[PDB]
Amino acid sequence: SSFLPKEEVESRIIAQVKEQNLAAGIKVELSSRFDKDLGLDSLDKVELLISLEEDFGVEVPDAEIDKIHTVEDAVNFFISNPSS
Amino acid sequence: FKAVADVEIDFSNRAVLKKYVGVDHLSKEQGTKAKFIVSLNSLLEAVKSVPETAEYRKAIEATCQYRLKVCGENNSDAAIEEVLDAHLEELIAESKEELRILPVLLESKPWDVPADYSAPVFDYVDASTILDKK
Amino acid sequence: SYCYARKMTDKDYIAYDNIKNFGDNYLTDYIIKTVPKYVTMAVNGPAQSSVLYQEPTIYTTPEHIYALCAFLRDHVNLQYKTLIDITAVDYPERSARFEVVYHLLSPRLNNRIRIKVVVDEVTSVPSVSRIWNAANWFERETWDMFGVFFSNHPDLRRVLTDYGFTGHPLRKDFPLTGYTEVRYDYGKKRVISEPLELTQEFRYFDFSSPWDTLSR
Amino acid sequence: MTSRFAYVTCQKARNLYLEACRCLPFIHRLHKLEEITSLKEMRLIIKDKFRVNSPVTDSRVTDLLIFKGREELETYLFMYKQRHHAITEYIEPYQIKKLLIERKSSNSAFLDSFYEKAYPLVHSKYA
Amino acid sequence: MKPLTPSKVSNFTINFGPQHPAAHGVLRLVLEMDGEIIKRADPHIGLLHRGTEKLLEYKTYNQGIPYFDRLDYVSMMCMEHSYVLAIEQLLNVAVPLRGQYIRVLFSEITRIMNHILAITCHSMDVGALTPFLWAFEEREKLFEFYERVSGARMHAAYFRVGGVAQDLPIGLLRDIYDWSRQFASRVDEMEELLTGNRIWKERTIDVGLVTAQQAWDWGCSGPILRGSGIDWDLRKNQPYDVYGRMDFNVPIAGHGDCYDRYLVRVQEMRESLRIIYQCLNEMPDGLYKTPDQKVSPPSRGQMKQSMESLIHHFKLFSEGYHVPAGETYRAVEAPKGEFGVYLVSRGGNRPYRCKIRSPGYAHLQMLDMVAKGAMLADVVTIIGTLDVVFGEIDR
Amino acid sequence: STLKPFDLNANNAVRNGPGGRSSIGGVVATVFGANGFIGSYVVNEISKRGNQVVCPYRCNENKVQPLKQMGDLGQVVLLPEFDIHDDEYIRRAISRSNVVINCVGIRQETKNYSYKDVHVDFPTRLAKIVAESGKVERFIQVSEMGADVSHASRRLQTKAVGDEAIMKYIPDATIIRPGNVVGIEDYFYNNLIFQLSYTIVAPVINNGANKVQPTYILDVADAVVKILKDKKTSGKTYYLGGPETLTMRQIYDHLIDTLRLSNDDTVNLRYELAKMLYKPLDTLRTKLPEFPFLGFMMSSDYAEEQVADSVAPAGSLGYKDLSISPAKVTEGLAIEGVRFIRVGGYD
Amino acid sequence: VNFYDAPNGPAVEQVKIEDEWYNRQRTEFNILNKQPSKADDVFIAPNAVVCGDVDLYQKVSIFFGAVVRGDLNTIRIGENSTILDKAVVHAASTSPTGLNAATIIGSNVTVEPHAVLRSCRIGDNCIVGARSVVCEGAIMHPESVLAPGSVLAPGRQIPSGELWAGSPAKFVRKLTYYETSNVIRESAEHYYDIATGFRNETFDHGSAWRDAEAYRQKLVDYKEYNWVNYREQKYVMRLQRDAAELEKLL
Ligand SMILES: NC(=O)C1=CN([C@@H]2O[C@H](COP(=O)(O)OP(=O)(O)OC[C@H]3O[C@@H](n4cnc5c(N)ncnc54)[C@H](OP(=O)(O)O)[C@@H]3O)[C@@H](O)[C@H]2O)C=CC1
Ligand SMILES: CCCCCCCCCCCC(=O)SCCNC(=O)CCNC(=O)[C@H](O)C(C)(C)COP(=O)(O)O
């Protein structure tokens, strides 16, 4: 279901994740919960999703925002979606 | 009152008066006595939903009985207007307006209160009464 | 109901005798007996209509305000077709600080009634706009000046205060002069808001006498 | 129509923030703020505006605060407030903070305020 | 299997800014219009909100009277009158008959100037400028009466608790009577230019239609009620001064359009002239302010000859009178409608809460319902009939 | 942030308040050239903080109208008749003043006043008058960056000679030397725009090679405040260049881009030709009154100052010593003014 | 009772079934916004009832007593498909499977008497036997036959070329080439011939209206007949309903 390469989208999402103040230092990769691994706040999570909105020209549902939890989950969401 | 129209019209015609003051806006119907009787009887039928020993129902029954009496002795529709201080059209609209709030009163049921309900009332006594005399 | 002009001549009377009596002395008792759940207490005092008469004041709770207002407007004997105004008074000494006041007119009864709902900062008062369309702006003003939230209002927005004003000015804890002041800057060619400075401070003159007794 | 096979708001502020972020481009275009500020840059200010009210925990106070923040957003969205208002109250202070160069004062916080004014509670203008 | 039907969309969210041929003051009006027809009107107010209500709380009762004069610059006397009536009700103070007559007389005079300004400024908004200038000379003659009684042409502050500040100067009653002898002819001159004019008729007929039910629902008062067929006047239904003695007839119209309200206002000017003539002929002799000197200042010779009067003067001009704890709402028939003050007293020398009920606030709220389906040009006429004053709307 | 005092003697006694319009700052200032572009912002900065500013001006009530709004009651004092040759008026102007700022300068010569008068004689005379008083504690003179004794242009040479005279009489004076100042009322971008749009051809001296360091007016105004808030700055010259060094061709191109001009209207009027076209017109200027048609751009001095690099010397004091980060003049708020004209979505 | 947003308007006069003195049943009639569509050669028996969104293709025959109710969802009957006597075709609002709940009948399909079809896909050249029930979501593939007295449970499938029988319908035998090619089509053609016959002796307006016209003429002669402008009354009723709906407080 990956419309575009997994490596590319992952590198891009982690590039935007690095832009946030924390979510870096020793662990910035997959399998990192936004609020339980990276120290991100919920508002910061929503803003990060909006920055990914600008990067990949595709919207995210709010209920999906309730469903998204990880760096794996966000890249999975963006690869799944045909507009990408 | 004084009409603000230069044109000369007869205000004792009892229809030119109603056309001038705009009662037709309130109701396009003519508003005869029989319509008033029907409206009062329909209000009496409606208030049956309210419990029998409810002060509101007794009030509506008393008011409807008073107005049905006033219709009784007075055979002239204008006489009813004089006694009730209203045009027959707005008297008829009155019962419908009462009908409108029956659903809202049956949802909250204000008449249900405990048998120890007590509403404190504070009353003002004027000094002019005491100072002038007792 | 609606005081449509009926009598062309000799309407010198203020109103009929029966209509005056029923509203001069039976109005509060009639309200209490007819709709007891809504009423918590009643005060008869100096009349709003006139100096000589006496007009009722009814205290009710926020939950019952909509039904009490609907009863007052459309009851055959009591037809308060008009909402004169809606007001709040801040009483910081009380736990329930705000007293929302409703003023009504019955053209048929030629009488005025005052309805009070006592709330606090957190609680909300249901909007009565469906009963009287005039309420919308009055409740918006009450929200602006005092901070009382009105539930189910079509669009509760500030009216009087400047755009971006967050404080509620008529609260007794709000400074008379406020917190900010407005000036044009030459450097930034914009009109800007700054913290308050007063060239001459407001002089509060304490005129109270120890011997006075009227103060409650 | 049946077979056995047939049938087999703690975050109100997050929603308000999402509404603000989604409405940001519209106010950028309505208020002609494209060139002066970026969307991400304003998205950063909005969080600080949200963070000032963190300590509250009562639900009712939270409701009032959310309603007031929605009003603040609606003022810009409906053109009640103007472009210069947006410049003065959000964009200019944020840009000023970035352009600020300050010497790390060796004196503690007490010494600096003691040198500055007798009553620390009184504000200072044009610091 | 029956086709559905789509609809059309409205745009053109105009902003109608402060605009000179309109009701005086600054009006910001946001109008949503489908083409040339308005679909929603949202008046933006607060442009003349001076915080009057909160300022009253920091002043003594006599110190707060000048606020009511400046709430409505067209009708000062009626505005301060409600405040003094409410303080009198709480204080239980009785006004002497001469002062009651002087209040009724000057209230009718300010009513007449208000109606003159309203009608001629409305005609100016339409585009006729001759009635406007023809009216300023009359309004000057009436401002001259004000400057005679108070020394201020506009903000007199003449009405006081328990009576009037000073007595009528000698020769005033004759001059007012002469102005009255010629007023009816002047009004007829104005009436011919407006009434009967085809362009005025076309501009005003069937514009701003209001029905009695709508007026009561929106809380309207005065000319708006009487142009729709409602025989309701506070001066008659709820008299507040020697108005009960006065003999005058309510003007009534039924259509509710702009023209009907204009005709009502002209007839109201005539009725006010009748009331003034009755006031002039029946003006009593005696005290103009209340004899009680614990609520009214003593006379100057009296303060200069008596110890008790000097004490009362000092304590009334420094502390002021103490109003007993209580609440009251007193309304007066202002020229623009019903103006009322809700005064809350806790027993001190300053008001705790002074709510002002604006007659024009509810009319501006009614603007949206009235100005639905109208045009950009009709808004000016509709605003003219409401006759809204924004210092009065924004307290 | 902690408010820093104006480092003036006995300020601690007089100063009181938060530092705003209604507060009391212990600075009484005589700003010569107040109605000018540079002077008005300096007056605004000083008066904004509650200080009193004396503004001597040549009789012109409409030109000095903005200065009236600058300060609270009695803070902005406008003296009606200012002449550079009148000693008694200068003494009266600086009577109560403890800081004097000189922003008086002429871009071009006229019949009444030459460069040598305004840029040399007035600084020397004012320096003597300030020196004899003793109450004046701080002196600030505003000059161009490119001012040098060995400069072809007469304006930039006379300015440096006047600065040296000021340094001789008052040793503790600070010489502020900003670059081409960008502002709403500036003579840099406004003249360039007028050249691009209402002139038949835009002559560019050489190919725009000359390098410049433009700075925003608010930065220079803040720099003046930082000079006055430190006594250690006295006796030093500060080259207040902008954050970015740009050639004149880049600025012309970027103005064309921001305004979205159809194409490039600039032409190559190389040097050695302007030196022949404008050379008689200078003699024309010295014998005729002020005329709007020709000025500043149409002079040999402008060509001579546009053939050199007006950039800060490497070893030099600047904004960093004053702890100010200059804002870019090609982006942000600085460029809004030219932006309002046209941006291609506009008209 | 009265649907005020009905496409043709509210009903000015509604008559009770007790007050009817004759049978007024219509063979094709409109249920609110759903209109049945028929071709020129489609035969509907006088007894038959067709209502709702039912689309009748060319050569469709609806025989006596058959009810085709297209109220909940769409019914489509294909070319030369015959619904025989007392056979009910109905559509469900939703199907259990989750597919479209329309009742689509293919071409040359014979639905034998008293067979009930509800929200099923019936393929071309199919026979549903007498008293055979095909439930919601059941799909019969083309050239398949369901024997009399058999039930297809919801969501079940009958493959092509097969004969199925039993209450839990099960495979019996494969239909032969001759059967599928000829006989299934031939049955539909025979019933088309019968329906063509019935159509040929049908008058456009048969002489049953005369009896009601006699009563109407008697009312006219005795001056009780009233002329009602139903269009204007519908307009007035809708206006009054809108005004009342605006007035109501709850
Ligand atoms: N691009 C710039 O703006 C830069 C400016 N500077 C220097 O700063 C100084 C001023 O800058 P700017 O303000 O732009 O120049 P302005 O010409 O705009 O200001 C000049 C001021 O001096 C006054 N003035 C000029 N000649 C006389 C005179 N003969 N007698 C009395 N007053 C006089 C003017 O008053 P009037 O209006 O009546 O002439 C005006 O107030 C100049 O020396 C300039 O070189 C430094 C760096 C760059
Ligand atoms: C240019 C236009 C700009 C518009 C500016 C609008 C600014 C609006 C500011 C209003 C601020 C509020 O609402 S404050 C809303 C009420 N404040 C509360 O604290 C309630 C619960 N708070 C929390 O959970 C955390 O503090 C929190 C960090 C919020 C995590 O958010 P989440 O609950 O998701 O987890």
Residue ID of nearest Cα to ligand 2 atom 8: D69
Q: What are phi and psi of E240, to 5 degrees?
A: -120, -15
Sequence-distant (6+) residues with CB within 8 A of E387 are E23, E118, E122, E223, E336, E360, E363
Sequence-distant (6+) residues with CB within 8 A of G193 are none
Helix, strand, coil tally for chain E in percent (to 5) = 50, 15, 35
Exposed / middle / buried, residue D122 (Cβ in 10 Å: 0-12, 13-18, 19+): exposed
Contact F128, F134 (CB under 8 A): no
* Structure tokens, A11: 């590198």
Contact C125, C119 (CB under 8 A): yes
Instruction: Give G249 to chain B, closest Cα distance, Å.
Output: 7
Contact A55, A74 (CB under 8 A): no
- For tokens 């009958």, name the residue: G158
In the three-class reduction of DSSP (H, G, I as helix; E, B as strand; rest coil), residue E215 is classed as helix
Selected for mutation to probe chain E from C49, C86, C111 (highest E CB count within 10 Å) is C49
As a whole number of Å, the CA-based R_g of chain C is 22
* Structure tokens, F341: 């004209």
Question: Cα–Cα distance between E27 and C214 in angstroms, integer?
Answer: 44
**CA–CA distances in Å: residue C30 to residues C39, D38, E162:** 11, 66, 36
Q: CB E94: neighbour CB atoms within 10 A?
A: 15
Contact F105, F118 (CB under 8 A): yes
Determine whether the shortest distance from the Cβ of D39 to ligand 2 is under 6 A.
no
Question: Cα–Cα distance between C186 and F43 in angstroms, integer?
Answer: 10
* Structure tokens, C200: 């001459």
State the ligand closest to the CA atom of D51.
2
∠ CA(E43), CA(E48), CA(E49), 5° rounding?
100
G96 interfaces chain D, CB cutoff of 8 Å: yes
Determine whether the shortest distance from the Cβ of D46 to ligand 2 is under 6 A.
yes
SS (H, E, C) chain A: CCCCCHHHHHHHHHHHHHHCCCCCCCCCCCCCECCCCCCCCHHHHHHHHHHHHHHCCCCCCHHHHHHCCEHHHHHHHHHHCCCC
What strands lie across the sheet with C111-119, from one edge to the other? B121-123, C39-46, C54-60, C111-119, C98-106, C82-90
* Structure tokens, C45: 């005092």
Sequence-distant (6+) residues with CB within 8 A of F291 are none
**CA–CA distances in Å: residue C208 to residues A72, E153, E322, E350, E351:** 73, 35, 10, 10, 14
What residues are paired with C104 via a beta bridge?
Answer: C83, C113
∠ CA(C71), CA(C105), CA(E231), 5° rounding?
120
Structure solved via: cryo-EM
- β-bridge pairing F266-269 and F202-205: parallel
DSSP string, G167-232: TTTEEEEEPPHHIIIIIHHHHHHHHHHHHHHHHHT--TT-TTHHHHHHHHHHHHHTT------HHH
Question: Cα–Cα distance between G238 and G9 in angstroms, integer?
Answer: 8
Determine whether the shortest distance from the Cβ of F181 to ligand 1 is under 6 A.
yes
Q: Provide the angle, in degrees to the nearest 10, between the axes of the packed helices F217-228 and F37-48.
A: 50
Contact C5, E229 (CB under 8 A): yes
As a whole number of Å, the CA-based R_g of chain E is 23
Contact C36, E319 (CB under 8 A): no
In the three-class reduction of DSSP (H, G, I as helix; E, B as strand; rest coil), residue E342 is classed as strand
Question: Cα–Cα distance between G24 and C203 in angstroms, integer?
Answer: 92
The region that residue E326 occupies, defined by phi over 0 for left and psi between -120 and 50 for alpha, beta otherwise, is: left
- β-bridge pairing C190-195 and C180-185: antiparallel
In the three-class reduction of DSSP (H, G, I as helix; E, B as strand; rest coil), residue B45 is classed as helix
* Structure tokens, E167: 């007595």
- β-bridge pairing F266-269 and C124-126: unpaired
Question: Cα–Cα distance between A16 and C1 in angstroms, integer?
Answer: 68
- Identify the DSSP state of E255: S
Selected for mutation to probe chain D from G136, G139, G151 (highest D CB count within 10 Å) is G136
Q: CB F213: neighbour CB atoms within 10 A?
A: 23
Contact E43, E328 (CB under 8 A): no
Residue closest to E389 by CA, chosen among E69, E58, E104: E69
As a whole number of Å, the CA-based R_g of chain F is 20
- For tokens 């309900």, name the residue: B117
Hey, are the CB atoms on F18 and D35 less than 8 Å from each other?
A: no
Sequence-distant (6+) residues with CB within 8 A of E129 are E123
Q: CB E364: neighbour CB atoms within 10 A?
A: 22
* Structure tokens, A32: 């990192």
Question: Cα–Cα distance between G58 and G192 in angstroms, integer?
Answer: 11
Exposed / middle / buried, residue D101 (Cβ in 10 Å: 0-12, 13-18, 19+): exposed
Contact C185, D84 (CB under 8 A): no
**H or E, element range at D14:** helix D12-30
CA C179 to the chain's CA centroid? 27
**H or E, element range at F53:** strand F52-56
Largest pairwise CA distance in chain F: 61
What residues are paired with E82 via a beta bridge?
Answer: none
Selected for mutation to probe chain G from E2, E4, E211, E217 (highest G CB count within 10 Å) is E2
Would you state the CATH architecture of domain E44-393? Orthogonal Bundle (1.10)
What CA dihedral angle connects F203, F206, F208 and F213, to 10 degrees? Answer: -110
Tell the CATH topology of F11-246+307-341. Rossmann fold (3.40.50)
Helix, strand, coil tally for chain F in percent (to 5) = 35, 15, 50
- For tokens 């006075």, name the residue: C212
Hey, are the CB atoms on B94 and C1 less than 8 Å from each other?
A: yes
Contact G72, G90 (CB under 8 A): yes
**H or E, element range at E194:** helix E172-194
* Structure tokens, E326: 């209580």
Hey, are the CB atoms on B20 and E92 less than 8 Å from each other?
A: no
- β-bridge pairing F246-247 and F211-212: antiparallel
Task: Give partners of E (≥3 CB pairs < 8 A).
Answer: B, C, G
Question: Cα–Cα distance between B34 and B36 in angstroms, integer?
Answer: 5
In the three-class reduction of DSSP (H, G, I as helix; E, B as strand; rest coil), residue E52 is classed as helix
For chain F, the structural domain boundaries read: 11-246+307-341
Determine whether the shortest distance from the Cβ of F104 to ligand 1 is under 6 A.
yes
Question: Cα–Cα distance between E339 and E362 in angstroms, integer?
Answer: 11
Residue ID of nearest Cα to ligand 2 atom 10: D69
Q: What are phi and psi of G55, to 5 degrees?
A: -110, 115
Question: Cα–Cα distance between F63 and A41 in angstroms, integer?
Answer: 55
Alpha-helix runs per DSSP H in E23-160: 52-56, 65-71, 76-91, 97-126, 130-150
Long-range CB pairs of F310-315 (<8 Å, 24+ gap) are F310/F144, F310/F145, F310/F146, F310/F179, F310/F180, F310/F210, F310/F211, F310/F212, F310/F213, F311/F145, F311/F211, F311/F212, F311/F213, F311/F241, F311/F245, F312/F145, F312/F179, F312/F213, F312/F239, F312/F241, F313/F239
B125 interfaces chain G, CB cutoff of 8 Å: no
DSSP string, F74-143: TTEEEES---TT-HHHHHHHTSS-SEEEE----SS--SS--HHIIIIIHHHHHHHHHHHH----EEEEE-
Residue closest to E271 by CA, chosen among E241, E233, E216, E221: E233
D125 interfaces chain A, CB cutoff of 8 Å: no
Please tell me what resolution, in angstroms, this structure has: 3.1
State the ligand closest to the CA atom of F242.
1
What residues are paired with G157 via a beta bridge?
Answer: G139
Instruction: Give B102 to chain G, closest Cα distance, Å.
Output: 10
For chain E, the structural domain boundaries read: 44-393
Residue closest to C168 by CA, chosen among C102, C115, C117, C92: C92
* Structure tokens, E61: 């009762």
Contact F63, F37 (CB under 8 A): no
Please report, as a single letter, which amino acid is at residue G200: N
Helix, strand, coil tally for chain G in percent (to 5) = 25, 25, 50
Contact B106, B49 (CB under 8 A): yes
Q: Which of D18, D51, D62, D64 to mutate to test the pocket of ligand 2 (most atoms within 8 A of CB)?
A: D62
Residue closest to G110 by CA, chosen among G45, G192, G42: G192
Buried b or exposed e, range G158-182, using 16+ CB within 10 angstroms: bebbbbbbeeebeeeeebeeebbee
User: Which residues on chain D are in Cβ contact (under 8 Å) with G93?
Assistant: 1
